[PDB]
Structure formats: C-alpha cells, structure tokens
Design a protein around this motif. Structure first.
Motif, PDB file in Angstrom:
ATOM      1  N   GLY A 180       8.489 -73.907 -65.403  1.00 55.48           N
ATOM      2  CA  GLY A 180       8.961 -72.280 -65.269  1.00 55.48           C
ATOM      3  C   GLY A 180      10.119 -72.214 -65.402  1.00 55.48           C
ATOM      4  N   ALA A 181      11.420 -73.254 -64.956  1.00 55.05           N
ATOM      5  CA  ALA A 181      12.474 -73.440 -64.174  1.00 55.05           C
ATOM      6  C   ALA A 181      13.496 -72.804 -65.939  1.00 55.05           C
ATOM      7  CB  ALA A 181      12.782 -74.625 -63.787  1.00 55.05           C
ATOM      8  N   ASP A 182      13.946 -71.976 -65.322  1.00 54.85           N
ATOM      9  CA  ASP A 182      15.445 -71.097 -66.269  1.00 54.85           C
ATOM     10  C   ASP A 182      16.242 -72.216 -66.565  1.00 54.85           C
ATOM     11  OD1 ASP A 182      13.029 -69.230 -66.820  1.00 54.85           O
ATOM     12  OD2 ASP A 182      14.237 -68.357 -64.379  1.00 54.85           O
ATOM     13  N   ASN A 190      15.327 -72.742 -74.209  1.00 55.90           N
ATOM     14  CA  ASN A 190      15.888 -72.992 -74.000  1.00 55.90           C
ATOM     15  C   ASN A 190      16.087 -73.482 -72.464  1.00 55.90           C
ATOM     16  OD1 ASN A 190      16.986 -73.219 -76.342  1.00 55.90           O
ATOM     17  ND2 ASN A 190      19.092 -73.769 -75.458  1.00 55.90           N
ATOM     18  N   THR A 191      16.492 -74.682 -72.225  1.00 52.49           N
ATOM     19  CA  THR A 191      16.431 -74.719 -70.574  1.00 52.49           C
ATOM     20  C   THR A 191      17.987 -75.066 -69.997  1.00 52.49           C
ATOM     21  OG1 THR A 191      14.256 -75.641 -70.179  1.00 52.49           O
ATOM     22  CG2 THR A 191      15.298 -75.722 -68.440  1.00 52.49           C
ATOM     23  N   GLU A 192      18.603 -74.524 -68.909  1.00 56.03           N
ATOM     24  CA  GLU A 192      20.036 -74.783 -69.016  1.00 56.03           C
ATOM     25  C   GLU A 192      19.293 -76.102 -67.195  1.00 56.03           C
ATOM     26  OE1 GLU A 192      21.768 -72.596 -70.565  1.00 56.03           O
ATOM     27  OE2 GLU A 192      22.812 -73.657 -70.822  1.00 56.03           O
ATOM     28  N   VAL A 193      20.814 -77.203 -67.787  1.00 56.17           N
ATOM     29  CA  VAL A 193      20.736 -78.147 -66.641  1.00 56.17           C
ATOM     30  C   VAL A 193      22.912 -78.034 -66.335  1.00 56.17           C
ATOM     31  CG1 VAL A 193      20.216 -80.244 -66.112  1.00 56.17           C
ATOM     32  CG2 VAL A 193      19.385 -79.331 -67.253  1.00 56.17           C
ATOM     33  N   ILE A 216      24.440 -71.743 -54.590  1.00 54.15           N
ATOM     34  CA  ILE A 216      24.839 -70.826 -55.429  1.00 54.15           C
ATOM     35  C   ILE A 216      23.162 -69.404 -55.016  1.00 54.15           C
ATOM     36  CG2 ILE A 216      22.385 -70.360 -57.209  1.00 54.15           C
ATOM     37  CD1 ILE A 216      23.497 -73.652 -58.106  1.00 54.15           C
ATOM     38  N   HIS A 217      22.422 -69.596 -54.313  1.00 56.12           N
ATOM     39  CA  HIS A 217      21.819 -68.938 -52.940  1.00 56.12           C
ATOM     40  C   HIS A 217      22.855 -68.076 -52.707  1.00 56.12           C
ATOM     41  CE1 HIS A 217      18.015 -67.181 -51.508  1.00 56.12           C
ATOM     42  NE2 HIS A 217      19.116 -66.647 -50.505  1.00 56.12           N
ATOM     43  N   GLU A 218      23.357 -68.349 -51.674  1.00 52.83           N
ATOM     44  CA  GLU A 218      25.070 -67.658 -50.546  1.00 52.83           C
ATOM     45  C   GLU A 218      25.476 -66.450 -52.152  1.00 52.83           C
ATOM     46  OE1 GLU A 218      25.733 -69.810 -47.281  1.00 52.83           O
ATOM     47  OE2 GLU A 218      24.644 -68.224 -47.403  1.00 52.83           O
ATOM     48  N   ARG A 219      25.892 -67.095 -52.953  1.00 51.15           N
ATOM     49  CA  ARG A 219      26.901 -66.378 -53.926  1.00 51.15           C
ATOM     50  C   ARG A 219      25.979 -65.146 -55.254  1.00 51.15           C
ATOM     51  NH1 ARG A 219      28.794 -63.265 -56.655  1.00 51.15           N
ATOM     52  NH2 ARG A 219      30.586 -64.100 -58.387  1.00 51.15           N
ATOM     53  N   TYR A 220      24.333 -65.344 -55.532  1.00 49.54           N
ATOM     54  CA  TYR A 220      24.054 -65.128 -56.001  1.00 49.54           C
ATOM     55  C   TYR A 220      22.889 -64.022 -55.630  1.00 49.54           C
ATOM     56  CZ  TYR A 220      27.481 -67.307 -59.361  1.00 49.54           C
ATOM     57  OH  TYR A 220      28.660 -67.632 -60.091  1.00 49.54           O
ATOM     58  N   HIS A 221      22.402 -64.047 -54.377  1.00 49.51           N
ATOM     59  CA  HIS A 221      21.045 -63.662 -54.020  1.00 49.51           C
ATOM     60  C   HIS A 221      21.252 -62.694 -53.965  1.00 49.51           C
ATOM     61  CE1 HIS A 221      17.884 -62.436 -51.499  1.00 49.51           C
ATOM     62  NE2 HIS A 221      18.517 -61.506 -50.893  1.00 49.51           N
ATOM     63  N   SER A 222      23.002 -61.456 -53.810  1.00 49.19           N
ATOM     64  CA  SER A 222      22.609 -60.441 -53.594  1.00 49.19           C
ATOM     65  C   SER A 222      22.837 -59.361 -54.483  1.00 49.19           C
ATOM     66  CB  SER A 222      24.566 -59.708 -52.709  1.00 49.19           C
ATOM     67  OG  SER A 222      25.320 -60.535 -53.309  1.00 49.19           O
ATOM     68  N   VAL A 223      23.368 -60.387 -55.596  1.00 47.78           N
ATOM     69  CA  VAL A 223      22.751 -59.318 -57.025  1.00 47.78           C
ATOM     70  C   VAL A 223      22.215 -59.909 -58.094  1.00 47.78           C
ATOM     71  CG1 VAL A 223      25.942 -59.657 -56.547  1.00 47.78           C
ATOM     72  CG2 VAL A 223      24.464 -61.746 -58.441  1.00 47.78           C
ATOM     73  N   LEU A 224      21.275 -60.424 -57.770  1.00 44.71           N
ATOM     74  CA  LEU A 224      19.974 -61.643 -58.864  1.00 44.71           C
ATOM     75  C   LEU A 224      19.245 -61.673 -57.797  1.00 44.71           C
ATOM     76  CD1 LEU A 224      20.399 -62.018 -61.896  1.00 44.71           C
ATOM     77  CD2 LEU A 224      20.113 -64.875 -61.050  1.00 44.71           C
ATOM     78  N   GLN A 225      18.339 -59.493 -58.094  1.00 45.48           N
ATOM     79  CA  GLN A 225      16.866 -59.781 -56.786  1.00 45.48           C
ATOM     80  C   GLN A 225      16.031 -60.876 -57.448  1.00 45.48           C
ATOM     81  OE1 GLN A 225      13.251 -58.652 -55.695  1.00 45.48           O
ATOM     82  NE2 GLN A 225      14.412 -58.347 -57.967  1.00 45.48           N
ATOM     83  N   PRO A 226      15.931 -61.085 -58.186  1.00 45.17           N
ATOM     84  CA  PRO A 226      14.474 -62.505 -58.557  1.00 45.17           C
ATOM     85  C   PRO A 226      15.510 -63.861 -59.189  1.00 45.17           C
ATOM     86  CG  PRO A 226      15.386 -60.851 -61.144  1.00 45.17           C
ATOM     87  CD  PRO A 226      16.123 -60.701 -60.287  1.00 45.17           C
ATOM     88  N   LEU A 227      15.654 -63.679 -57.899  1.00 42.95           N
ATOM     89  CA  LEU A 227      16.590 -65.162 -57.731  1.00 42.95           C
ATOM     90  C   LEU A 227      15.402 -66.247 -56.772  1.00 42.95           C
ATOM     91  CD1 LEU A 227      18.992 -67.056 -57.989  1.00 42.95           C
ATOM     92  CD2 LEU A 227      19.821 -66.197 -56.067  1.00 42.95           C
ATOM     93  N   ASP A 228      14.998 -67.203 -57.656  1.00 42.31           N
ATOM     94  CA  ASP A 228      14.244 -67.913 -56.884  1.00 42.31           C
ATOM     95  C   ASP A 228      14.381 -69.683 -56.546  1.00 42.31           C
ATOM     96  OD1 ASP A 228      11.889 -69.895 -57.066  1.00 42.31           O
ATOM     97  OD2 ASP A 228      10.006 -67.930 -56.975  1.00 42.31           O
ATOM     98  N   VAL A 229      15.732 -69.813 -55.832  1.00 42.67           N
ATOM     99  CA  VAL A 229      15.744 -71.496 -55.728  1.00 42.67           C
ATOM    100  C   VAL A 229      15.006 -72.070 -54.731  1.00 42.67           C
ATOM    101  CG1 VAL A 229      17.716 -72.902 -55.154  1.00 42.67           C
ATOM    102  CG2 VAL A 229      18.173 -70.700 -55.624  1.00 42.67           C
ATOM    103  N   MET A 232      15.910 -65.547 -62.513  1.00 41.04           N
ATOM    104  CA  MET A 232      15.860 -67.195 -62.519  1.00 41.04           C
ATOM    105  C   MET A 232      15.476 -67.776 -61.186  1.00 41.04           C
ATOM    106  SD  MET A 232      18.623 -67.457 -64.868  1.00 41.04           S
ATOM    107  CE  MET A 232      17.952 -65.499 -65.533  1.00 41.04           C
ATOM    108  N   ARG A 233      14.610 -67.676 -62.078  1.00 36.58           N
ATOM    109  CA  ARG A 233      13.842 -69.830 -61.049  1.00 36.58           C
ATOM    110  C   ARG A 233      14.726 -71.122 -61.426  1.00 36.58           C
ATOM    111  NH1 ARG A 233       8.859 -68.896 -64.690  1.00 36.58           N
ATOM    112  NH2 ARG A 233       8.588 -66.397 -64.481  1.00 36.58           N
ATOM    113  N   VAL A 234      15.517 -71.498 -60.748  1.00 36.24           N
ATOM    114  CA  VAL A 234      16.313 -72.338 -60.254  1.00 36.24           C
ATOM    115  C   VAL A 234      15.645 -73.663 -59.510  1.00 36.24           C
ATOM    116  CG1 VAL A 234      18.335 -73.085 -59.264  1.00 36.24           C
ATOM    117  CG2 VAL A 234      18.426 -70.787 -60.409  1.00 36.24           C
ATOM    118  N   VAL A 235      15.456 -74.487 -60.276  1.00 40.00           N
ATOM    119  CA  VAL A 235      15.122 -75.980 -59.315  1.00 40.00           C
ATOM    120  C   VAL A 235      16.263 -76.997 -59.182  1.00 40.00           C
ATOM    121  CG1 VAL A 235      13.726 -78.258 -59.433  1.00 40.00           C
ATOM    122  CG2 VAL A 235      13.045 -75.934 -60.194  1.00 40.00           C
ATOM    123  N   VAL A 236      16.585 -76.614 -58.085  1.00 43.20           N
ATOM    124  CA  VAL A 236      17.537 -78.693 -57.343  1.00 43.20           C
ATOM    125  C   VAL A 236      17.045 -79.269 -57.244  1.00 43.20           C
ATOM    126  CG1 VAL A 236      19.263 -78.691 -56.240  1.00 43.20           C
ATOM    127  CG2 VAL A 236      19.069 -76.370 -56.520  1.00 43.20           C
TER     128      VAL A 236
END
Ligand SMILES: Cc1cc2nc3c(=O)[nH]c(=O)nc-3n(C[C@H](O)[C@H](O)[C@H](O)COP(=O)(O)OP(=O)(O)OC[C@H]3O[C@@H](n4cnc5c(N)ncnc54)[C@H](O)[C@@H]3O)c2cc1C
Ligand SMILES: Cc1cc2nc3c(=O)[nH]c(=O)nc-3n(C[C@H](O)[C@H](O)[C@H](O)COP(=O)(O)OP(=O)(O)OC[C@H]3O[C@@H](n4cnc5c(N)ncnc54)[C@H](O)[C@@H]3O)c2cc1C
Ligand SMILES: C[C@H](N)c1ccccc1
Ligand SMILES: C[C@H](N)c1ccccc1
Lengths: 341, 339
Positions: free
Chosen positions: A174-176, A302-305, A19-32, A1-5
C-alpha cells in the motif's frame, strides 16, 4: 500519502522526522511508518565514534558540502537548549594531526575556532609535525537515535520490525512513497556496485579524563586508518581501521592490537582505562551519497522511491542536510500530484 | 639538617618535594618531615575547582606572574607522560565570558591558543557579549595530593598527623628549618592581619557530557562571584561565590541557590545532572603571597622559618613557582650554615 521509511539508523529516522515535521500540517492523510530489521543499539549508527567532522578532501558531489554545513548549523543551534545532551549533543574541542603540512580542509569555517597548531601544542603529540585545532560537536549515535525515536513516536509515527525483501512487496502493501535508508545493505533491494562496506572496528573505554578529540592521519593509508580518540558522552571511542570491501562482522585480534597500541602510543594515559566493549560496523561507502528520486511500476500504479544511502564515514556529520533534501524531493512528489504547500 | 614542612595541602607537599628533589643528592644528612593536622581529602586544596587560571588583573608583585608561568610550563610538560591523569592532570579548553569588552589578561600567552570569541561563538551564550577562548590544564587537587604524597613517601619523607601549637614547639623538638605552608590558618602561629578567608562554596555534579570550562565574570561583584563550570576528571565543579572575611565553614542555602540557578541558566543541560556533593572551602586571601625567610630564636640556636602562604584562589595555578623559590631560599640557608 502512505510513506514507508526503510531504515532506523540516523539517516532513516532523521528523514522520517524531517518529512513529518514539514508536511503533517498541510497533508492530513499523511501516514508515515518506519520498517527496519535493526534498531538501536544494533545499527551502524550506534557504533559511530560520535564526532562531527567531514572527510579531509572535498567530496565528489559538492552538494555534500552544503549538507554538512546545514547539519552543523542545525546542531549548533541546539547548544544553549536544555535538551542538547539528551539529544546526544555536546560541544567538544580537539586536534587533527599530520606528519606533514597539508592544505586547510574545506570545512574549516564550518567548525568553530579553526587554527593551526603551535609548536607547544605539537610537543603534546611527539610523532606529528603539523595539525589543526578546532571546536566541533559530539553527536552520539545511540542517544540521538533514542531521541529521534521518541520525537517520532510522539508525533504518531509507527515503528515495525520488518526485514524488507523487495520494494515490490512494500508498494503492494500500500505504500505510495518509499524512502530507502538502508545504509550499507541497500544493494539487497536494488543492485548498486558503487556501494561497499567500510569496515571499522573500535574499542570503547572508560577514560573520563580525556576531554578532547584526537585524530591522526596517515596520507598513505587512507582515511581513519590511523589512530583516533573521541570522547563520548559516557565513554571514549578508540579507533584506527577503516577497510573497504571487507564484510567480516566479527571483531578480529589484529585490528584490536592496531587500535590499542596506536592509541596507547598517542595517549599513554590509556594504560589505566577500563575496556568496556569492542565493536565492528560497516560504513556505507560510495563515491557519493545516493539521494535521488526513482519511479517504480508494479501493476498499473506507480510507486515513488526516494533513496538516501551511502554516507560512508560521515552519516552523523551530514544527515540533516540529506533529510532536508529528501523532504524537498517529497515536496515535488506532492506538487506533481496537484497537492499544495 | 632537619626540615619540618607544616602543611599537607598543595603548597606544603609541592614545597617538600621540591626541596627534597633538589637537595637529597648533595646534602647528607637531610631529614624532611611533613606535619599537618589534615591530609587529603580534608584540605582546602581537595575542594579546589581544579583549573589553571590566574586572576584577571595582574598581580602587585611581578614575581607572582613568573611563578604562575613556571607552574604552567611545569604541568604542561607532563602532558605526554603516561602518569599525567594519575597526577590529576589533563588538558581542557574553555570559555571566559564578559558582559562587555575587557583588556586581555597578562597570562594570555602562557596558556595555549588564546583568542577572542567570534560572534558565532557568542550566540552559544545569550547573556554575554564578549569573551575569550583558550586551552589550559585541569589539576585536580585531590588526585595531585595523593600523587605528591606517594612521591614523597617513596623518597622516605615521613608524615605526621599533628596540630602545631607554635613555631617554638617545632624548633625545640629539633627542627633546624621550618617551612610554613599553613594556608588560611597561618594567623594562628603568627598574627597576620592581611590574611583573610576567601569563602568559596561549590556543587559537585555528575555531568560527564560537559567537556569545556565555562567561566563568567561580573565586573561589579568581584572575582568568582559569577557562575563558573569546570569539568573535572570524574565530576564537574559548579561555582559562583567567593566572599572575603567569612569564616563559616558550613554550606548555606543562599550560596547553593546562587550557584545552582546561575549555572543552570549558563548550562541548562544541568537539569539532568546528579548532585554528588556540596562543599565549602577557605582560600587564603592576602594582598600578596607571603614567601619569605624569617629568623626565630628559641633556646641555644636560631631556627629558620620560610613562609609560603596566602595564595588566595590561585594556589594550584601558582604552587610550583612558589615551591621553587622556597627551595632557592633554602639553598641560601644551607650556605650561610656552611653546608
Ligand atoms: C566505526 C565507525 C565510526 C564512525 N564514526 C562516525 C563519526 O564519528 N561521525 C560520522 O559522521 N560518521 C561516522 N560513521 C559513519 C556512518 O555513516 C554512520 O555510522 C551511519 O550510521 C550510517 O547511517 P545509516 O542510517 O545509513 O545506516 P545504519 O545506521 O546502518 O542503519 C540502516 C538501517 O537500515 C535497516 N535495513 C537495511 N536493510 C534493510 C531491509 N532490507 N529491511 C529492513 N531494514 C533494513 C537496518 O536494519 C538499519 O535500521 C562511522 C562509521 C563507523 C563504521
Ligand atoms: C572553592 C575553591 C575553589 C578553588 N579553585 C581553585 C582552582 O580552580 N584553581 C586554583 O589554582 N586554585 C583554586 N583555589 C585556591 C586553592 O584551593 C588554594 O589557594 C590552595 O588550596 C591553598 O593551598 P594551601 O596548601 O596553602 O592550603 P590548604 O590546602 O588549606 O593546606 C593547609 C594545610 O596546613 C595545615 N595546617 C594549618 N595549620 C596547621 C597547624 N597549626 N598545625 C598543623 N597543620 C596545619 C592543614 O591541615 C593543611 O594540611 C580554590 C579555593 C577554593 C576555596
Ligand atoms: C570518527 C570517524 N568518522 C571514523 C570513521 C570510520 C571509522 C572510525 C572513525
Ligand atoms: C576557578 C577559581 N580558581 C575558583 C576560585 C574559588 C572558588 C571557585 C573557583
């Protein structure tokens, strides 16, 4: 996921961390990433008095009560930790004062050592006939923002100076997933007439002898339209105005006087306190916090907000529960896409 | 009536004020002078942690409990006053921590909002299993002495930096009444083998985020030989040693370590606190306070001495009730002299 806060106040940064703490380990392409047009010390959060304490009445959305509680237990759990003060956190005890008998607040068991004031205690505060004592926590907006941005930075979360003009532009960049933590200005990105500015003015003062918070209430004039005194880590915040609908960001003379004279009356030792600064901020006032998922369509994708705004005069008090709830909704986004925790 | 108060610590100055405030209006002439060889900031009083709290066991003399109570009520009643902080006074709340259950203290109703700590509260303090919460008052020794000396000075009480060699000398110099508030050095003017130095070392630190007092107790090592943390007006006092009989007025290394590591363990945020100073003082330890009248005879008249010393580690806590009692005894002196 690309996540823009979007937002670097307490709500934005806590949510990004959670979010980062909870999902860094299980979702490798996590871009916050964090986008914002104001960072500490220039956010509403930096101007907050610093105290954990919900409004006196039960909130419209009772979920808010749990979020407050989770926030307290979270913060409390850091007391004993070597870095609690560096996080902006320290325990404080204090008084809530009324001109007449009132019911106990719903949060009376969340704080520590809640009780009614005794006659001798009431003698310290002549103008008042009823009140509470309890122990709570200072969470200094300024320091906590600095702690969060360091924790985020170490975890590889990147910050960008950006005034966002629309959700569209961020989605097409590009944000998902967009997390909307834009505080009182959310209406700019999507009209929300339930969201109003809560104009609060304060005077910061050097009066290190004051060790306790003192909050007076005026049942007729509405919440925080009555003198209040809150010791911070290095300074003391004096308050007393909290006016909904007023967008004036400049300090005015009439509120200065209301605050000074109200607080000098409450705490006459203030005569010798040196004024260090005067500030005005806008609480994001809403009948309830907006914390919900929304799907937006731009082109074929679709983009998720996920919105997280409208925390009024209790953003510090409630932030962590809200961040946890956003992370839960983020989990559901993932699971809707066959991704796993 | 020439009254010489010897001593300019909390005991001496409080007593001098109390006497003067009580009799200035009705006795002309009344001449009250203070003699001492150290003024603020150089007295034991200046080094005091600053907290109102008696020892955990009740006193032998039941009068002392009342003096403590009168002191609390006196100081409390200044809260609300615009000058409370300039007096060195502010309210504080805090914790008393034990490794096991103990009885309630005799002073539990004197303080405000006394109660036992709840299980949740105890988690904040991993090393301890039982304790108290209450609200009390900070009385900063330094600021209170500056306040008392200003109040005294404005009322025409005069001070003299003077080392007194004997009571005799002061009587011969023209004092009708001597008030002996010489603290731990009273033995120099009249041997008192019950009077011993209570050596306390402390570390002063800038850690303004700490808003509560925290006092730990070790039932095995004696009062104040266990870490304690007391927020002052501008600084925080860290403590943890209190040895009777030790006359070394120099800071040492072991006590520094005992204080720092004990307190860093209690309050680990202290890692970022800047050391401001390290000090050593002598509490005037005595099985009980000496507060009594004595007649001395030099030359052609009697001279009346009223002792007020031996307040151990609770002189700030008890001073005002003692000052009141001395002023009472002074009243008796005046009537025996037909004034
Ligand atoms: C005087 C005062 C005292 C208070 N005291 C307390 C207290 O003691 N305890 C308590 O719990 N609460 C208190 N509050 C309540 C309030 O919730 C907090 O102040 C809180 O800061 C709100 O958090 P936030 O992150 O949503 O908004 P903010 O801190 O305002 O941050 C919003 C962020 O969004 C960014 N942003 C907005 N729009 C855009 C855009 N279009 N593009 C890019 N960035 C954008 C901003 O730049 C900013 O970074 C107080 C409020 C006031 C006014
Ligand atoms: C580290 C420490 C912390 C403490 N913390 C607390 C606390 O938190 N709360 C509390 O209640 N108590 C506390 N105490 C106890 C308190 O400090 C003492 O009980 C109190 O200061 C004694 O007051 P005093 O006026 O009798 O003695 P001092 O303040 O020592 O005054 C003695 C005075 O007599 C003078 N003097 C003596 N002999 C002569 C002479 N021959 N000629 C002329 N002048 C003379 C001295 O110069 C001085 O002016 C503490 C003590 C210590 C050591
Ligand atoms: C401290 C309290 N949360 C507050 C809210 C709005 C304005 C001032 C103070
Ligand atoms: C706080 C207490 N009165 C104390 C006494 C001696 C040394 C340190 C502290």
């Amino acid at each position: 996921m690309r996540v823009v806060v979007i937002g670097a106040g307490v709500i934005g940064l806590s949510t990004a961390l959670c979010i980062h703490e909870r999902y860094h380990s299980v979702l490798q392409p996590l871009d916050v990433k964090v986008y914002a047009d104001r960072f500490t010390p220039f956010t509403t959060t930096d101007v907050a008095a610093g105290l954990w304490q919900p409004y006196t009445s039960e909130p419209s959305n009772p979920q808010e009560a749990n979020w407050n509680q989770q926030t307290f237990n979270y913060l409390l759990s850091h007391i004993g930790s070597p870095n609690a003060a560096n996080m902006g956190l320290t325990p404080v005890s204090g008084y809530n004062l009324f001109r007449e008998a009132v019911p106990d607040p719903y949060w009376k068991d969340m704080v520590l050592g809640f009780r009614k004031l005794t006659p001798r205690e009431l003698d310290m505060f002549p103008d008042y006939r009823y009140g509470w004592f309890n122990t709570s926590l200072i969470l200094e907006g300024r320091k906590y923002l600095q702690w969060l941005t360091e924790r985020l930075t170490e975890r590889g979360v990147k910050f960008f100076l950006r005034k966002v003009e629309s959700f569209e532009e961020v989605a097409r960049g590009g944000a998902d997933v967009i997390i909307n933590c834009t505080g009182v200005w959310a209406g700019v990105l999507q009209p929300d007439p339930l969201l109003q500015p809560g104009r609060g003015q304060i005077i910061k003062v050097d009066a290190p002898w004051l060790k306790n918070f003192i909050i007076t209430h005026d049942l007729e004039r509405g919440i925080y339209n009555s003198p209040l005194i809150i010791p911070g880590l290095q300074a003391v915040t004096l308050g007393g105005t909290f006016q909904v609908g007023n967008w004036n960001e400049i300090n005015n003379i009439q509120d200065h006087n209301t605050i000074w004279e109200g607080c000098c009356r409450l705490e006459p030792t203030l005569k010798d306190a040196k004024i260090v600064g005067e500030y005005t901020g806008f609480g994001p006032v809403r009948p309830q916090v907006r914390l919900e998922r929304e799907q937006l369509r731009f082109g074929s994708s679709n983009t998720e907000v996920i919105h997280n705004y409208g925390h009024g005069g209790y953003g510090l008090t409630i932030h962590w529960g809200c961040a946890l709830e956003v992370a839960k909704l983020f989990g559901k986004v993932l699971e809707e896409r066959n991704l796993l925790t």
